[PDB]
mmCIF file with all atom_site columns, C-alpha atoms in Angstrom:
data_model
loop_
_atom_site.group_PDB
_atom_site.id
_atom_site.type_symbol
_atom_site.label_atom_id
_atom_site.label_alt_id
_atom_site.label_comp_id
_atom_site.label_asym_id
_atom_site.label_entity_id
_atom_site.label_seq_id
_atom_site.pdbx_PDB_ins_code
_atom_site.Cartn_x
_atom_site.Cartn_y
_atom_site.Cartn_z
_atom_site.occupancy
_atom_site.B_iso_or_equiv
_atom_site.pdbx_formal_charge
_atom_site.auth_seq_id
_atom_site.auth_comp_id
_atom_site.auth_asym_id
_atom_site.auth_atom_id
_atom_site.pdbx_PDB_model_num
ATOM 1   C CA . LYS R 1 1   ? -132.700 -109.530 20.526 1.00 45.13 ? 144 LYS R CA 1
ATOM 2   C CA . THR R 1 2   ? -134.152 -108.193 17.205 1.00 48.39 ? 145 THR R CA 1
ATOM 3   C CA . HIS R 1 3   ? -133.198 -104.590 18.246 1.00 48.82 ? 146 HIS R CA 1
ATOM 4   C CA . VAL R 1 4   ? -130.240 -103.065 20.163 1.00 45.79 ? 147 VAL R CA 1
ATOM 5   C CA . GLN R 1 5   ? -130.088 -99.617  21.829 1.00 45.51 ? 148 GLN R CA 1
ATOM 6   C CA . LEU R 1 6   ? -126.984 -97.768  20.601 1.00 43.90 ? 149 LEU R CA 1
ATOM 7   C CA . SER R 1 7   ? -125.548 -94.249  21.050 1.00 45.41 ? 150 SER R CA 1
ATOM 8   C CA . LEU R 1 8   ? -123.599 -93.497  17.831 1.00 44.35 ? 151 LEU R CA 1
ATOM 9   C CA . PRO R 1 9   ? -120.829 -90.862  17.831 1.00 42.35 ? 152 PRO R CA 1
ATOM 10  C CA . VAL R 1 10  ? -121.639 -88.191  15.162 1.00 41.62 ? 153 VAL R CA 1
ATOM 11  C CA . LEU R 1 11  ? -118.419 -87.390  13.203 1.00 40.86 ? 154 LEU R CA 1
ATOM 12  C CA . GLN R 1 12  ? -117.532 -84.419  10.966 1.00 42.99 ? 155 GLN R CA 1
ATOM 13  C CA . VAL R 1 13  ? -116.951 -85.703  7.403  1.00 42.77 ? 156 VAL R CA 1
ATOM 14  C CA . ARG R 1 14  ? -113.467 -84.038  7.155  1.00 43.82 ? 157 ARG R CA 1
ATOM 15  C CA . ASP R 1 15  ? -112.311 -85.893  10.321 1.00 42.38 ? 158 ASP R CA 1
ATOM 16  C CA . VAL R 1 16  ? -113.222 -89.392  9.099  1.00 43.74 ? 159 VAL R CA 1
ATOM 17  C CA . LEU R 1 17  ? -110.084 -91.504  8.534  1.00 42.16 ? 160 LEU R CA 1
ATOM 18  C CA . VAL R 1 18  ? -111.740 -94.650  7.055  1.00 42.61 ? 161 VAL R CA 1
ATOM 19  C CA . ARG R 1 19  ? -114.373 -93.363  4.653  1.00 42.85 ? 162 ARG R CA 1
ATOM 20  C CA . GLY R 1 20  ? -116.397 -96.576  4.119  1.00 41.16 ? 163 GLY R CA 1
ATOM 21  C CA . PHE R 1 21  ? -116.795 -100.213 5.069  1.00 42.47 ? 164 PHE R CA 1
ATOM 22  C CA . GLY R 1 22  ? -115.625 -102.009 1.900  1.00 40.15 ? 165 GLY R CA 1
ATOM 23  C CA . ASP R 1 23  ? -116.088 -102.704 -1.758 1.00 38.05 ? 166 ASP R CA 1
ATOM 24  C CA . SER R 1 24  ? -119.517 -104.392 -2.297 1.00 41.68 ? 167 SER R CA 1
ATOM 25  C CA . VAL R 1 25  ? -123.080 -103.833 -1.012 1.00 43.70 ? 168 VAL R CA 1
ATOM 26  C CA . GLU R 1 26  ? -122.970 -107.174 0.874  1.00 43.82 ? 169 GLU R CA 1
ATOM 27  C CA . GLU R 1 27  ? -119.500 -106.386 2.410  1.00 42.33 ? 170 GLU R CA 1
ATOM 28  C CA . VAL R 1 28  ? -120.472 -102.882 3.595  1.00 42.51 ? 171 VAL R CA 1
ATOM 29  C CA . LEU R 1 29  ? -123.716 -104.099 5.258  1.00 41.41 ? 172 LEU R CA 1
ATOM 30  C CA . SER R 1 30  ? -121.754 -106.985 6.890  1.00 41.20 ? 173 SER R CA 1
ATOM 31  C CA . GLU R 1 31  ? -118.946 -104.709 8.165  1.00 41.37 ? 174 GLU R CA 1
ATOM 32  C CA . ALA R 1 32  ? -121.411 -101.985 9.321  1.00 41.76 ? 175 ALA R CA 1
ATOM 33  C CA . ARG R 1 33  ? -123.281 -104.602 11.412 1.00 39.20 ? 176 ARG R CA 1
ATOM 34  C CA . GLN R 1 34  ? -119.971 -105.954 12.796 1.00 34.26 ? 177 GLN R CA 1
ATOM 35  C CA . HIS R 1 35  ? -118.750 -102.390 13.770 1.00 36.09 ? 178 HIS R CA 1
ATOM 36  C CA . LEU R 1 36  ? -122.187 -101.645 15.337 1.00 36.57 ? 179 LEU R CA 1
ATOM 37  C CA . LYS R 1 37  ? -121.849 -104.824 17.488 1.00 35.62 ? 180 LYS R CA 1
ATOM 38  C CA . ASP R 1 38  ? -118.163 -103.919 18.453 1.00 37.23 ? 181 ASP R CA 1
ATOM 39  C CA . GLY R 1 39  ? -118.964 -100.233 19.278 1.00 35.57 ? 182 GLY R CA 1
ATOM 40  C CA . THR R 1 40  ? -116.613 -99.033  16.487 1.00 36.09 ? 183 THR R CA 1
ATOM 41  C CA . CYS R 1 41  ? -119.230 -97.373  14.192 1.00 38.08 ? 184 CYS R CA 1
ATOM 42  C CA . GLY R 1 42  ? -119.701 -93.618  13.655 1.00 36.64 ? 185 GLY R CA 1
ATOM 43  C CA . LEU R 1 43  ? -122.446 -91.586  11.998 1.00 36.24 ? 186 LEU R CA 1
ATOM 44  C CA . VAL R 1 44  ? -122.035 -88.676  9.525  1.00 32.92 ? 187 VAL R CA 1
ATOM 45  C CA . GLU R 1 45  ? -125.107 -86.458  9.060  1.00 33.80 ? 188 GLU R CA 1
ATOM 46  C CA . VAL R 1 46  ? -125.849 -86.093  5.305  1.00 34.20 ? 189 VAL R CA 1
ATOM 47  C CA . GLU R 1 47  ? -125.715 -82.515  3.931  1.00 33.19 ? 190 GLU R CA 1
ATOM 48  C CA . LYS R 1 48  ? -124.689 -81.082  0.518  1.00 36.45 ? 191 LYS R CA 1
ATOM 49  C CA . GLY R 1 49  ? -121.080 -82.159  -0.243 1.00 38.32 ? 192 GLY R CA 1
ATOM 50  C CA . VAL R 1 50  ? -120.855 -84.970  2.368  1.00 39.32 ? 193 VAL R CA 1
ATOM 51  C CA . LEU R 1 51  ? -121.379 -88.129  0.254  1.00 36.88 ? 194 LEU R CA 1
ATOM 52  C CA . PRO R 1 52  ? -118.830 -87.222  -2.503 1.00 34.61 ? 195 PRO R CA 1
ATOM 53  C CA . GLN R 1 53  ? -116.229 -87.044  0.365  1.00 34.68 ? 196 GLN R CA 1
ATOM 54  C CA . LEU R 1 54  ? -116.988 -90.688  1.402  1.00 35.03 ? 197 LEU R CA 1
ATOM 55  C CA . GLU R 1 55  ? -116.504 -94.041  -0.367 1.00 36.02 ? 198 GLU R CA 1
ATOM 56  C CA . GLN R 1 56  ? -119.261 -96.044  -2.100 1.00 35.64 ? 199 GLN R CA 1
ATOM 57  C CA . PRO R 1 57  ? -120.921 -98.334  -1.461 1.00 36.94 ? 200 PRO R CA 1
ATOM 58  C CA . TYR R 1 58  ? -122.592 -96.226  1.318  1.00 39.96 ? 201 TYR R CA 1
ATOM 59  C CA . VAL R 1 59  ? -124.408 -97.661  4.382  1.00 39.73 ? 202 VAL R CA 1
ATOM 60  C CA . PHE R 1 60  ? -127.279 -95.426  5.610  1.00 37.49 ? 203 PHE R CA 1
ATOM 61  C CA . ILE R 1 61  ? -129.301 -95.631  8.809  1.00 37.61 ? 204 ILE R CA 1
ATOM 62  C CA . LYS R 1 62  ? -132.918 -94.938  7.870  1.00 42.55 ? 205 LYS R CA 1
ATOM 63  C CA . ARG R 1 63  ? -135.958 -94.453  10.168 1.00 38.33 ? 206 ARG R CA 1
ATOM 64  C CA . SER R 1 64  ? -137.913 -97.785  10.198 1.00 41.05 ? 207 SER R CA 1
ATOM 65  C CA . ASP R 1 65  ? -140.980 -96.417  12.124 1.00 42.81 ? 208 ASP R CA 1
ATOM 66  C CA . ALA R 1 66  ? -142.437 -93.408  14.146 1.00 40.04 ? 209 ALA R CA 1
ATOM 67  C CA . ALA R 1 67  ? -139.063 -93.701  19.238 1.00 42.40 ? 210 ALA R CA 1
ATOM 68  C CA . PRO R 1 68  ? -138.637 -95.885  22.386 1.00 43.99 ? 211 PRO R CA 1
ATOM 69  C CA . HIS R 1 69  ? -136.601 -94.605  25.435 1.00 41.14 ? 212 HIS R CA 1
ATOM 70  C CA . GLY R 1 70  ? -135.557 -91.576  23.249 1.00 40.64 ? 213 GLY R CA 1
ATOM 71  C CA . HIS R 1 71  ? -134.030 -94.035  20.640 1.00 40.29 ? 214 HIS R CA 1
ATOM 72  C CA . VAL R 1 72  ? -135.273 -93.671  16.985 1.00 38.62 ? 215 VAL R CA 1
ATOM 73  C CA . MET R 1 73  ? -135.906 -97.102  15.403 1.00 39.95 ? 216 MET R CA 1
ATOM 74  C CA . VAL R 1 74  ? -133.572 -97.500  12.399 1.00 41.79 ? 217 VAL R CA 1
ATOM 75  C CA . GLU R 1 75  ? -132.481 -100.056 9.831  1.00 43.86 ? 218 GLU R CA 1
ATOM 76  C CA . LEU R 1 76  ? -129.560 -100.348 7.386  1.00 43.88 ? 219 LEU R CA 1
ATOM 77  C CA . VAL R 1 77  ? -129.831 -99.575  3.623  1.00 44.39 ? 220 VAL R CA 1
ATOM 78  C CA . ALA R 1 78  ? -126.765 -99.669  1.289  1.00 42.95 ? 221 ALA R CA 1
ATOM 79  C CA . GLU R 1 79  ? -126.325 -97.548  -1.857 1.00 39.41 ? 222 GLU R CA 1
ATOM 80  C CA . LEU R 1 80  ? -124.060 -98.154  -4.919 1.00 38.12 ? 223 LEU R CA 1
ATOM 81  C CA . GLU R 1 81  ? -124.156 -96.100  -8.201 1.00 38.76 ? 224 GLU R CA 1
ATOM 82  C CA . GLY R 1 82  ? -127.601 -94.696  -7.284 1.00 33.09 ? 225 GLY R CA 1
ATOM 83  C CA . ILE R 1 83  ? -129.238 -98.069  -6.459 1.00 33.42 ? 226 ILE R CA 1
ATOM 84  C CA . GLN R 1 84  ? -130.413 -98.814  -2.864 1.00 35.09 ? 227 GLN R CA 1
ATOM 85  C CA . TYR R 1 85  ? -130.561 -102.283 -1.299 1.00 38.10 ? 228 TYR R CA 1
ATOM 86  C CA . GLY R 1 86  ? -133.235 -102.045 1.313  1.00 37.49 ? 229 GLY R CA 1
ATOM 87  C CA . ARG R 1 87  ? -136.356 -99.866  1.452  1.00 41.53 ? 230 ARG R CA 1
ATOM 88  C CA . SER R 1 88  ? -136.836 -97.600  4.540  1.00 41.08 ? 231 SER R CA 1
ATOM 89  C CA . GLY R 1 89  ? -137.627 -94.099  5.861  1.00 42.15 ? 232 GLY R CA 1
ATOM 90  C CA . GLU R 1 90  ? -135.712 -90.813  6.233  1.00 42.01 ? 233 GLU R CA 1
ATOM 91  C CA . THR R 1 91  ? -131.859 -90.995  6.379  1.00 43.42 ? 234 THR R CA 1
ATOM 92  C CA . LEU R 1 92  ? -130.444 -90.188  9.882  1.00 46.21 ? 235 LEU R CA 1
ATOM 93  C CA . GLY R 1 93  ? -126.927 -90.340  8.371  1.00 44.19 ? 236 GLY R CA 1
ATOM 94  C CA . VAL R 1 94  ? -124.229 -92.440  6.725  1.00 43.67 ? 237 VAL R CA 1
ATOM 95  C CA . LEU R 1 95  ? -122.304 -95.002  8.808  1.00 43.43 ? 238 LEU R CA 1
ATOM 96  C CA . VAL R 1 96  ? -118.485 -95.131  8.781  1.00 41.19 ? 239 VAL R CA 1
ATOM 97  C CA . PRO R 1 97  ? -115.860 -96.927  10.846 1.00 42.17 ? 240 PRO R CA 1
ATOM 98  C CA . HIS R 1 98  ? -114.928 -95.066  14.033 1.00 46.12 ? 241 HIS R CA 1
ATOM 99  C CA . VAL R 1 99  ? -111.172 -95.152  14.776 1.00 47.85 ? 242 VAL R CA 1
ATOM 100 C CA . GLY R 1 100 ? -110.919 -92.485  17.535 1.00 50.72 ? 243 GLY R CA 1
ATOM 101 C CA . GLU R 1 101 ? -112.275 -89.355  15.816 1.00 53.36 ? 244 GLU R CA 1
ATOM 102 C CA . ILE R 1 102 ? -113.763 -86.863  18.322 1.00 53.48 ? 245 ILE R CA 1
ATOM 103 C CA . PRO R 1 103 ? -117.554 -86.654  17.885 1.00 55.34 ? 246 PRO R CA 1
ATOM 104 C CA . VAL R 1 104 ? -119.700 -83.472  17.862 1.00 55.45 ? 247 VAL R CA 1
ATOM 105 C CA . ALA R 1 105 ? -122.733 -85.252  19.347 1.00 54.32 ? 248 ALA R CA 1
ATOM 106 C CA . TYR R 1 106 ? -124.362 -88.669  19.880 1.00 58.05 ? 249 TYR R CA 1
ATOM 107 C CA . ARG R 1 107 ? -127.441 -90.068  18.046 1.00 61.47 ? 250 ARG R CA 1
ATOM 108 C CA . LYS R 1 108 ? -129.488 -92.553  20.176 1.00 61.84 ? 251 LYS R CA 1
ATOM 109 C CA . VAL R 1 109 ? -130.972 -95.279  17.930 1.00 61.74 ? 252 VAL R CA 1
ATOM 110 C CA . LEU R 1 110 ? -132.740 -98.630  18.316 1.00 61.00 ? 253 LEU R CA 1
ATOM 111 C CA . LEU R 1 111 ? -131.070 -100.709 15.541 1.00 63.92 ? 254 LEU R CA 1
ATOM 112 C CA . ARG R 1 112 ? -133.002 -103.519 13.857 1.00 65.33 ? 255 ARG R CA 1
ATOM 113 C CA . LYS R 1 113 ? -130.335 -106.321 14.018 1.00 69.69 ? 256 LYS R CA 1
#
């Protein structure tokens, strides 16, 4: 399928133990997609002070369109030293590995895969 319904655990930035997916734009997009498939991906909502507490390159979920079955359609965009790889809509948050952190909420998305 081109899209997959997911419910992503929303994590507090200060709880996150593994603060990014790797060391290159291509690696972080690869690992993000792998963790999304394996159900081991979390979401951090972006506010002032969040991104400096995480590791670049960043992987964002961005709104790809205006929301089936209560799931916002999203796609992945990576960022490194202020350059984005991908072009999309509003940021829903930054993706991180999930390794058992307790979430504050869930974000229902339809992920373009």
